[PDB]
Amino acid sequence: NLDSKGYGVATPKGSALGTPVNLAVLKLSEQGILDKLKNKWWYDKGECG
């Protein structure tokens, strides 16, 4: 990659769901769920093999 960017889960400023959503994302990242979803939706359903 020529640069580094990231996708986030946006929330309105000051909302109470900000911290819970951030921690949920971190949990899913550490549990390998995000990698599992990536593999499922990019390669398991890929038509090239």
Partner: protein, 137 residues
């Protein structure tokens, strides 16, 4: 809880029979699953929404009005946006972003290399050109 999103494969997709389906059952994709998991972890009831104008979000230089998902979040029309919304300084100044659930960057796409039609003098290819020259010498 309203989960604004943008229809963009594989993040959000319409099921083969979405006409007969209603509610969250209509959609599928990476971000549908991500929203499901996030709701499970946070313990909330959520409804998926597709932003009307189908834009990630930007500030109008004239009206100074945010559009897209960022506009929905800014003006209270949505509670959360589970979508491939890049973390940027301008957006981060008006909303809250979680840590990157996906890391990406600029990359190069090229057509897959394919066997080329043999050259006219490809019969000399087994040996290097220096070998042929030294053979003549």
């Amino acid at each position: 809880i309203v989960v604004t999103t943008i229809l963009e494969s594989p993040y959000v997709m319409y099921k083969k029979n979405h006409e007969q389906l209603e509610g969250n059952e209509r959609y599928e994709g990476y971000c549908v699953d991500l929203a499901y998991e996030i709701a499970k972890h946070v313990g909330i009831k959520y409804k998926l929404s597709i932003v009307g104008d189908g834009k990630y979000g930007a500030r109008d230089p004239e009206t100074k009005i945010w559009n897209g998902m960022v506009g929905e979040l800014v003006y209270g029309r949505a509670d959360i946006a589970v979508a491939p919304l890049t973390i940027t300084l301008v957006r981060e100044e008006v909303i809250d972003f979680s840590k990157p659930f996906m890391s990406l960057g600029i990359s190069i796409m090229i057509k897959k290399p394919q066997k080329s039609k043999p050259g006219v003098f490809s019969f000399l290819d087994p040996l290097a050109y220096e070998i042929w020259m030294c053979i003549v010498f």
